[PDB]
């Protein structure tokens, strides 16, 4: 399948530099231009620039250029987005596509690189139990659940019982604190009738720390 | 450059159109009008290239046109799975930009019952406050449509320093959820009876309570 590979995601502080790839698979990599698109969280799609690989004629958007560089080896069927000085406001996902001359659209998008830009340092979460109580049950079912806070770079993922319990799982989106700081819940709805029987443990996966947490949550 | 609507919304079945106005060195000058799909956590996708023509896999109700200085895309037949953002994109003369993306739309399909909010509030654990932190979590679940609104209180009186919330994402059964978080000191924590939060949606309000004496 004709597919463009991206590099992994990057956390990085202000001022360091950056470069990302972008490798074309399953087709030709001169035959076709390449370009960067930046959507910075919550916003829409920017074009950055476009280069053709088979002789490095790159064309920047006015707003990036002398931002940034792109460039392309054409021998590993490789483009290049870098940066000597990276800003917070850099923080992003930048896409690769595959551009059509003349035409000029984006027929073929990879999946993206994330890159955080932050003055904070990498840190795993403290995870604490939301405990079902009276508060949390009405009728049969109640409420539990699992802060993951204070955690950075985002993603956490939250599993329950090691996958095996899916069914009322919600896990929310992440609160960004002042800190610079991640903070996230994960809540189930179980039955009442299991909370002396049942054992539910939430189990916090932070790869970008090398960190995982299992905890037990219980009747307070 | 590119005007889009920031938001179009329709029920299942029905027809809407996405309007994208430029000036007159892009579309105007009779270049031509691209499209892309962008699903929620995903890459974008092209979805109407040549103003008009579709790339294999794209279905029929999606159509493009233009006329003079704006393009609009149709979407005839929306179904669930056409709830997403919508970029046109084209090529500005003037400004040297080969390509120029549009503001963007978020489409919502309309149809589903309205549904009350299920408000669940939890106090800090004896285990954070260890730790000498106190943070109170207020999980808004099961409602439509997504906007809401949610208020902190300590013994009655509002408290604006320190809350974080969440935009209302969507949950597994296509209803919304969101969040709220209220950090206190152990010491602001222990100096109030009691703190609520309280939830606004479609005028009716829910108010949960939560107290360090529990």
Same mark, same amino acid.
């Given at each position: 399948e004709v597919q463009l590979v991206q590099s992994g995601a990057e956390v990085k502080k202000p001022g360091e530099s950056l470069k990302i790839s972008c490798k074309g698979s399953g087709? !030709? +990599?001169? !035959?076709y231009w390449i370009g960067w698109v930046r959507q910075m969280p919550g916003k829409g799609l920017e074009w950055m620039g476009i280069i053709y690989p088979?002789?490095?004629d790159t064309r920047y958007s006015p707003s990036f250029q002398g931002q940034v560089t792109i460039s392309a080896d054409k021998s590993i069927s490789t483009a290049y987005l870098q940066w000597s000085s990276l800003k917070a406001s850099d923080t992003a996902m930048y896409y690769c596509a595959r551009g059509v001359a003349?035409?000029?659209? +984006?027929?073929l998008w990879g999946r993206g690189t994330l890159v955080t830009v932050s003055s904070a340092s990498t840190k795993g979460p403290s995870v604490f139990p939301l405990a079902p109580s009276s508060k949390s049950t009405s009728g049969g079912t109640a409420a539990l659940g699992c802060l993951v806070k204070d955690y950075f770079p985002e993603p956490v993922t939250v599993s329950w019982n090691s996958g095996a319990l899916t069914s009322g799982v919600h896990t929310f989106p992440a609160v960004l604190q002042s800190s610079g700081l991640y903070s996230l819940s994960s809540v189930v709805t179980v039955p009442s !009738? !299991?909370?002396?029987?049942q054992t539910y443990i939430c189990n916090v996966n932070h790869k970008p720390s090398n960190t995982k947490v299992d905890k037990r949550v219980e009747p307070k | 450059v590119l005007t889009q609507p920031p938001s179009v919304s329709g029920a299942p079945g029905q027809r809407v159109t996405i309007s994208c106005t430029g000036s007159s060195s892009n579309i105007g000058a009779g270049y031509d009008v691209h499209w892309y799909q962008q699903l929620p956590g995903t890459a974008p996708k092209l979805l109407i290239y040549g103003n008009s023509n579709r790339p294999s896999g794209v279905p029929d109700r999606f159509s493009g046109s233009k006329s003079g200085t704006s393009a609009s895309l149709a979407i005839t037949g929306?179904?669930?799975?056409?709830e997403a953002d919508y970029y046109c994109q084209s090529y500005d003369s003037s400004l040297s930009a080969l390509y120029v993306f549009g503001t963007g739309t978020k489409v919502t399909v309309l149809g589903q019952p309205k549904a009350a909010p299920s408000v669940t509030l939890f106090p800090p654990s004896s285990e954070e406050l260890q730790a000498n932190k106190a943070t109170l979590v207020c999980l808004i679940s099961d409602?439509?449509?997504?906007a809401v609104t949610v208020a902190w209180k300590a013994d009655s009186s509002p408290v604006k320093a320190g809350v974080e919330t969440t935009t209302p994402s969507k949950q597994s059964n296509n209803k919304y959820a969101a969040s709220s978080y209220l950090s206190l000191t152990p010491e602001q924590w222990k100096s109030h009876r009691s703190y609520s939060c309280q939830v606004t949606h479609e005028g009716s309000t829910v108010e949960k309570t939560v107290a360090p004496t529990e």
């Open positions: 087709y !030709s +990599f001169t !035959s088979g002789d490095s003349v035409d000029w659209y +984006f027929d !009738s !299991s909370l002396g029987t | 929306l179904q669930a799975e056409d409602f439509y449509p997504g």
